[PDB]
Amino acid sequence: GSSGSSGWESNYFGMPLQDLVTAEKPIPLFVEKCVEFIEDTGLCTEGLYRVSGNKTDQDNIQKQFDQDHNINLVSMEVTVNAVAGALKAFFADLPDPLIPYSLHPELLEAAKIPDKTERLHALKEIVKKFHPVNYDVFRYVITHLNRVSQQHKINLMTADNLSICFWPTLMRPDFENREFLSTTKIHQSVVETFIQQCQFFFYNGEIVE
Prior knowledge:
Elements lengths: L16 H4 L8 H12 L14 H13 L5 H4 L3 H14 L10 H8 L4 H11 L7 H17 L1 H4 L3 H12 L16 H10 L1 H6 L6
Helix pairs in contact: 2-5, 3-5, 6-7, 8-10, 8-11, 10-11
Function: GTPase-activating protein for Rho family members.
Protein name: Rho GTPase-activating protein 5
Subcellular location: Cytoplasm; Cell membrane
C-alpha cells in the first residue's frame, strides 16, 4: 500500500503489471473488462476513441473496479467514451510504458524500413523481445484497435487515427537533454502498422493497406 502513480491509495492499482497479472492470466482484468466491454457493446460506435469521455465515469470505472473486481459495466450504464478513456489512462498510471526503452530505437529502425514486408518481419523480430509481462497485454491491445479500424467507416476511426491517440502514451520519450534535431515522426507509424497488420503479426493474417 504505497502511494505513487495513483493519487489515492489503492490495494491493486498503482502496483506494477508483473504484480497485477498472474501466471494463470497474463492479461490484466481491467483491460479485459474495459476492452471486452467496448467490443461487447458494439465496436462500430462513432468517435469511440476520440471523444474526451466524461471523466466523471472514468473516475468510478477504476475506483469501483478496485474496491470490487466483480463489477458489471453493462449494468453501470457507462459509455464507451468513458470505458475507453479509463483504459488508455490505466497504461499511463503504470510505472513504465507498455513499450520498453530497450526496444524504442529497435522499433524505429524496423519501422523506417522501405520494404513494407521487411518493415513488418523486422518488427516481429523485436515484438518478441518485449517483456514477457507487457508483451501479453500489448498483443491483446493491438488486436482490439485493429478490430475498430475494420468499421472505420462507421465508428469513424482508422488504425492511424487510433495509433495516433495511443502513441502519446504507449510510447513516452524521456530525454530532457540539451539536444535538438532528433525528433522522429515514426512513433506514430510504428503503432499504426502493428494495428493494420495486427493479424500478420499474430494471427498471421494478410498485410493490409
